[PDB]
Design a protein around this ligand. Structure first.
Ligand code: K
Ligand code: K
Length: 432
């Protein structure tokens, strides 16, 4: 459905509001849902994908009794909701759950959808999932406010000299999606040397660098998938490699960052969605480098979502299932990741304070290791040695001895970039 009506708020209803990019999902639909929830005294939670998007929502709901957190309407990020479900905090049994960008495949988002849909199925609440690409659908070219010219081309993924003149010959403004900051740096450097003005966006530099797009005379924005949500540009072109790095669990033993491999239809729709937004500016184009793949069962996030869900309580003995259209994404035995009370607290602390990936936290917690015991960071097999500048990374441990970083369980997400590695060295040293 692409239109909200009051009947959608009755218990037992789960509605997916297909709102194409630029439809006014935040500014138009949401306040109408919220005012009807407030009017009828439904205890409601609104779930935003990011803190950036949550701020936009606060603005669109100015004046309404809404309590933002990290009143009878609460607003929080998908991750905050799921984390609160895992903590001792007593989370209200909301009558209504509103999830924005409900296609988001972060483990906490997947788990939240499973918890919510289960509560609806149990007859305890209603839910509204808002997204341009409903889970279970595979249309990379949804509707837009203005027609988009879609052209498949050879998109460069490394610095280039010759060819790809269509890239530089463009006099408009382009948003370019790349799989990593590294890949972006090379592409930006190449573009800067060709005389173009480039601003690079990434999770850690967004808040500060996004501002520059609003006033500077930029030609290109080289960004990672963080611009898939909560980022509006005044652009007429999107270049999309249609690739990303995905964490994959190899032989239930380690997590690698595989790829770059094809993105999903929903990611491709969101990227394309950055353009075709302005009726008064037709002619926007989306230039893409390959096909999409629905086969993302190798993505670790699905299993990670199950690990989280198995540790969220609903009713004595009951284990929440994943949202039905996503349930087949994971091969797992129900409740197999349910941890007893103490190991569960360790798991939670490892993800929250420790900031470890869900899969890694689970391995450490299930082995009976306590939060602050970091010996496991140094006693793995030789092939788990972590490198810094292609040489073994080393850390001064809490007792002053310099040890080689060699964790018992290897998860590539802890050393994928300099910031991640720096953070994991701090963890190994007991500084967190
Ligand atoms: K809780
Ligand atoms: K479910």
């Amino acid at each position: 459905v692409e239109c909200f009506e009051p009947s959608m708020l009755k218990k037992k209803q789960l509605t997916v509001l297909d709102l194409h990019p630029g439809a006014g999902k935040t500014r138009r639909v949401l306040p109408e849902i919220v005012r009807e929830a407030i009017k009828t005294r439904l205890r409601t939670v609104i779930l935003a994908p990011t803190r950036v998007v949550a701020a936009e929502m606060e603005e669109a709901l100015r004046g309404l009794p809404v309590r933002y957190m990290t009143e009878i309407v609460d607003l929080m990020c998908h991750a905050t909701f799921t984390s609160r479900l895992l903590q001792p905090i007593r989370v209200p049994n909301y009558n209504l759950y509103i999830m924005d960008e409900a296609h988001f495949t972060d483990p906490s988002s997947i788990a939240a959808r499973g918890y919510i849909s289960t509560r609806v199925e149990m007859g305890e609440a209603a839910a509204i999932f808002m997204t341009a690409t409903p889970p279970g659908t595979r249309d990379a070219f949804p509707d837009s406010n203005s027609p988009i010219m879609d052209t498949e081309v050879e998109v460069p993924e490394r610095a280039w000299s010759s060819g790809f003149d269509w890239v530089t010959d463009h006099s408009g403004k382009t948003v370019w999606f790349v799989p990593s900051v590294r890949n972006g740096n090379e592409i930006a450097a190449c573009l800067t040397k060709a005389g173009k003005r480039v601003i690079q966006l990434s999770r850690k530099t967004f808040e500060t660098e996004f501002q520059k797009t609003k006033h500077q005379e930029w030609d290109f924005v080289v960004t990672t998938d963080i611009s898939e949500m909560g980022a509006n540009f005044k652009a007429d072109r999107v270049i999309d490699s249609r690739r990303c790095l995905k964490p994959v669990i190899l032989d239930g033993e380690r997590v690698i960052l595989a790829g770059p491999m094809p993105v999903t239809h929903a990611s491709a729709a969101q990227r394309r969605g950055r353009i075709g937004r302005n009726p008064n500016k037709p002619g926007d184009e989306y230039l893409y480098g390959g096909g999409c793949a629905e086969t993302d069962e190798d993505h670790a996030h699905w299993l990670e979502a199950r690990m989280l869900l198995d540790n969220i309580y609903l009713q004595d003995g009951l284990i929440a299932s994943l949202y039905r259209p996503e349930a087949d994404k994971v091969a797992a035995i129900e409740g197999e990741f349910k941890l007893r009370t103490e190991q569960r607290k360790t798991f939670v602390e490892l993800m929250k304070r420790g900031d470890l990936p869900v899969w890694l936290a689970y391995q450490v917690a299930s082995a009976g290791i306590t939060y602050t015991d970091r010996r496991w960071c140094f006693d793995g097999t030789t092939n788990n040695t972590i490198m810094e500048d292609s040489v073994p990374a080393e850390v001064w441990t809490r007792h002053g001895e310099k040890r080689v970083l060699k964790p018992r369980w290897m998860d590539a997400r802890v050393c994928s970039d300099h910031a991640a590695l720096k953070s994991f060295k701090e963890f190994a040293a007991g500084k967190r």
